């Protein structure tokens, strides 16, 4: 199944946001938040915001920060690209150990949506080759973290900034620069044509396997260039020598070579699924990553 | 898609309990640590234990507790149903509002996979007709919970305690009562056959409705006894009274009552979907419940 990393020291820094009438999450780091910084918007400013012009505008007291019950000083404030950075008066006594990453599509990570400042749920995403996301955020949910988590490190990759007409999510990295060619302006946006993660796609049916399940499999094999062939005609993501190398593990623990199972996938991209499932899907998942797949095995 | 509750609370309260060489998790609230009474079983006293008579020969000072690398000293123990309850000489700073509360059948929760006390994942299960859930469990996850949370309050529903020959999971509530017929010891033991869970599925078609997929809504109505024996055949779940209830605030939403919801179900059961999708799916989901459809929903 999806699984999303422990989220409790992320909910520990979620706080709340108003400016005017608009109302989102912080993420409150040592005696910094951090937030999107559409949060200085009207209406009359989200179609075209010249956003060094409003900032320039804005004093510390237009900033109400709430922790719970308390209003925490904001004493300075900057931006970064499309991040605000505002000082407060007070140091968040639990800032976990952290650091900024910026990651590549395909990868996964948890999110932690949260609304006025309180966590609501916790799922897992992949940053998608076309980085949208599919994610689940409602009005309010902008400055929503995902992150991940290694030992008791806190890698915050993503801040969420905005739902695109066709239902996925757009938002930047902790640096305030978007993932894909997305603006934080109040105007329909696309993205560009999104392709399969075809590395994930090749974990998840070797985790199909390890549990028992393999109808799926072939006697067949195939080169890995004749592999990409086909994988990029069904707008499948091309395999690399790098991910040929990163599927060993799970390779040799499962007895099949990974150019065999791409032989499997590739029968199934050609046949379809013919009605059978795996893992309980009709379609194939491409959202567990290689690691993903191993750690949960 | 499946969405967990925040864990933290959870994590806070989350120990580890060893006896000899046999670790697994338990759960820290105020004084008492809650955990699987198998604890206190050899690897080869799993096979089938005599728990009273295990207990008898174990005192306070057998049970190594540790949050963290940090010691609990346990200062009384009891044995409830197939559980465990240890006191400890410290109340857990970290104590949420909780309850226990024992689930029925299709209801969700969520799950704080845990290992030597040290949270690993969260995730979303649902409780199976036949009493078993689809968890990830792997050696060492005895004693990690499942639960929800409303407002400021943790409803632990699930500890967990084995696997089953098919691999799905079997555990109790925080009583120590097992979910469906299952008993703690390393015995060859069967699940039920299991069954789609139809009130969630209903929710399902009312989130579709919400969402302007409604070409399934069909002009007819039933009964609730005619629904019911039709539903069987397709190896689908009885509604209960209490089903009828849930579905409520989905049915006042929509304004489509819900026996007419079930009798656009029994067409889709008797005629199949004829090609068509719902909610860009084939496949009627049945792992999320009303309070799910309207959690995300809104
Ligand atoms: C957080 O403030 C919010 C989250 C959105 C709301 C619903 N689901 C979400 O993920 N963000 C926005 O509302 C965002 C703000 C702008 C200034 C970046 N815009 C947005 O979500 O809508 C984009 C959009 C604009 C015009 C249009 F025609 C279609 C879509
Ligand atoms: C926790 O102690 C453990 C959880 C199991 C182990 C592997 N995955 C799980 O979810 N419980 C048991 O091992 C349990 C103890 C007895 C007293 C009930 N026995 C059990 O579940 O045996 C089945 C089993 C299947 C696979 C496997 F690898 C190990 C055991």
């Given at each position: 199944?999806?699984?999303?990393?422990?989220?409790?020291?992320?909910?520990?820094?979620?706080?709340?946001?108003?400016?005017?009438?608009?109302?989102?999450?912080?993420?409150?780091?040592?005696?910094?938040?951090?937030?999107?910084?559409?949060?200085?918007?009207?209406?009359?400013?989200?179609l075209?915001?010249?956003?060094?012009?409003?900032?320039?505008?804005?004093?510390?007291?237009?900033?109400?920060?709430?922790?719970?019950?308390?209003?925490?000083?904001?004493?300075?404030?900057?931006?970064?690209?499309?991040?605000?950075?505002?000082?407060?008066?007070?140091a968040?006594?639990?800032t976990?150990?952290?650091?900024?990453?910026?990651?590549?599509?395909?990868?996964?990570?948890?999110?932690?949506?949260?609304?006025?400042?309180?966590?609501?749920?916790?799922?897992?995403?992949?940053?998608?080759?076309?980085?949208?996301?599919?994610?689940?955020?409602l009005?309010?949910?902008?400055?929503?973290?995902?992150?991940?988590?290694?030992?008791?490190?806190?890698?915050?990759?993503?801040?969420?900034?905005?739902?695109?007409?066709?239902?996925?999510?757009?938002?930047?990295?902790?640096?305030?620069?978007?993932?894909?060619?997305?603006?934080?302006?109040?105007?329909?946006?696309?993205?560009?044509?999104?392709?399969?993660?075809?590395?994930?796609?090749?974990?998840?049916?070797?985790?199909?396997?390890?549990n028992?399940?393999?109808?799926?499999?072939?006697?067949?094999?195939?080169?890995?260039?004749?592999?990409?062939?086909?994988?990029?005609?069904?707008?499948?993501?091309?395999?690399?020598?790098?991910?040929?190398?990163?599927?060993?593990?799970?390779?040799?623990?499962?007895?099949?070579?990974?150019?065999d199972?791409?032989?499997?996938?590739?029968?199934?991209?050609?046949?379809?699924?013919?009605?059978?499932?795996?893992?309980?899907?009709?379609?194939?998942?491409?959202?567990?990553?290689?690691?993903?797949?191993?750690?949960?095995?």
């Amino acid at each position: 199944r999806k699984m999303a990393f422990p989220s409790g020291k992320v909910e520990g820094c979620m706080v709340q946001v108003t400016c005017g009438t608009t109302t989102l999450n912080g993420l409150w780091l040592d005696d910094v938040v951090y937030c999107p910084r559409h949060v200085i918007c009207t209406s009359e400013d989200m179609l075209n915001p010249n956003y060094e012009d409003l900032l320039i505008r804005k004093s510390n007291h237009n900033f109400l920060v709430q922790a719970g019950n308390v209003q925490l000083r904001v004493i300075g404030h900057s931006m970064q690209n499309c991040v605000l950075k505002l000082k407060v008066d007070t140091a968040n006594p639990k800032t976990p150990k952290y650091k900024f990453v910026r990651i590549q599509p395909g990868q996964t990570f948890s999110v932690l949506a949260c609304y006025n400042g309180s966590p609501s749920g916790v799922y897992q995403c992949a940053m998608r080759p076309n980085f949208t996301i599919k994610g689940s955020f409602l009005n309010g949910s902008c400055g929503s973290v995902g992150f991940n988590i290694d030992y008791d490190c806190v890698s915050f990759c993503y801040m969420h900034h905005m739902e695109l007409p066709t239902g996925v999510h757009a938002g930047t990295d902790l640096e305030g620069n978007f993932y894909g060619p997305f603006v934080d302006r109040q105007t329909a946006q696309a993205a560009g044509t999104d392709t399969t993660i075809t590395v994930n796609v090749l974990a998840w049916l070797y985790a199909a396997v390890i549990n028992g399940d393999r109808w799926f499999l072939n006697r067949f094999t195939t080169t890995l260039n004749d592999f990409n062939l086909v994988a990029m005609k069904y707008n499948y993501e091309p395999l690399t020598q790098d991910h040929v190398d990163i599927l060993g593990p799970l390779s040799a623990q499962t007895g099949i070579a990974v150019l065999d199972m791409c032989a499997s996938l590739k029968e199934l991209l050609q046949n379809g699924m013919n009605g059978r499932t795996i893992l309980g899907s009709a379609l194939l998942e491409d959202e567990f990553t290689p690691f993903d797949v191993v750690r949960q095995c």
